[PDB]
Design a protein around this ligand. Sequence first.
Ligand SMILES: *[C@@H]1O[C@H](CO)[C@@H](O)[C@H](O)[C@H]1NC(C)=O
Ligand SMILES: [Ca+2]
Length: 364
Amino acid sequence: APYNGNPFEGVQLWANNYYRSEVHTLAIPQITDPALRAAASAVAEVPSFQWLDRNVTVDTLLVQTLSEIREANQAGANPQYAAQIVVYDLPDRDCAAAASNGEWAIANNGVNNYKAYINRIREILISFSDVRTILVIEPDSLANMVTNMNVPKCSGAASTYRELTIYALKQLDLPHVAMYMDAGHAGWLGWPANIQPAAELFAKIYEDAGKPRAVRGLATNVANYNAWSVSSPPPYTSPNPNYDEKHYIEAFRPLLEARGFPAQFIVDQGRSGKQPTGQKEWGHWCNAIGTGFGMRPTANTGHQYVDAFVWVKPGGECNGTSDTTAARYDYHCGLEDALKPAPEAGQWFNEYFIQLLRNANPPF
Ligand SMILES: *[C@@H]1O[C@H](CO)[C@@H](O)[C@H](O)[C@H]1NC(C)=O
Ligand SMILES: [Ca+2]
């Protein structure tokens, strides 16, 4: 069914069974403290995004989640449930990273692979038109075109990133869908030197895709730890005047809007409840210590440019291994402020889940 306006209005957000199963089968059996067990049970009910970060998730997880939401809705959920999905499988993924877990390469049929993936997602979303579906498009993609064009892999991938982003925006432009393109975070694109070039890029992409109706705007702070709004700059932010997501968005939106894209925002707060964090530097993104579960997902943001506070990166799923000998080891995961020992990316990291619970704000 179609919708008008903020896609988070008029619906409840579904808490998916993948994250719920992680908490109940992997986390809780390792927790003996009664209060931490009850807190863990509560966090399993908080609705976070489900990531299509490997092709095999499309005909498994996506179908299962949509099917379960349809069942719940037909069983009288009121308001009806909506889905929250991340599209995250560009070829030559994460072009500026030390290592990437992306499965596809431009040199090994990756363009065709990606187009087919988007096409299959489109078929499934059409099947499940009755389930309003909110998408984050490709974290750690186009932000690289703003600041990392000096990196050979990024320069070589840029036309592909742009073309395939446009492809997804047009193919997924369906009446029951909303899309938010990833736009980095305050400590990446929010630096004053980067903010106008970033606005130029995202507004051009939006134009070149034909300003698809389903595109609501941009997502920020995905898989990062930034504050929404704090009174004092965390020490690792200096001297960026845009030291939280509110400052970033308030500076960013006017530049985007003058360029034709009056973007609304969603802001990840799933690991933002403790401020400042235990990061020693802003660019230390992997399994950062001293972080907490943050404000609960809601459409009631109170801010004119923010459609929702969300939990995009699910807390407890590892950002990368601390094993320096692993094939896809990223040195960020070995830093002094990265919790260790850490399993492979995507594996449940229970010590990190417990950290998030202990530092949760609001508490569980
Ligand atoms: C991706 O998964 C689909 C099924 O959803 C399958 O048909 C296709 O072959 C897979 N892609 C690749 C490149 O293996
Ligand atoms: Ca510093």
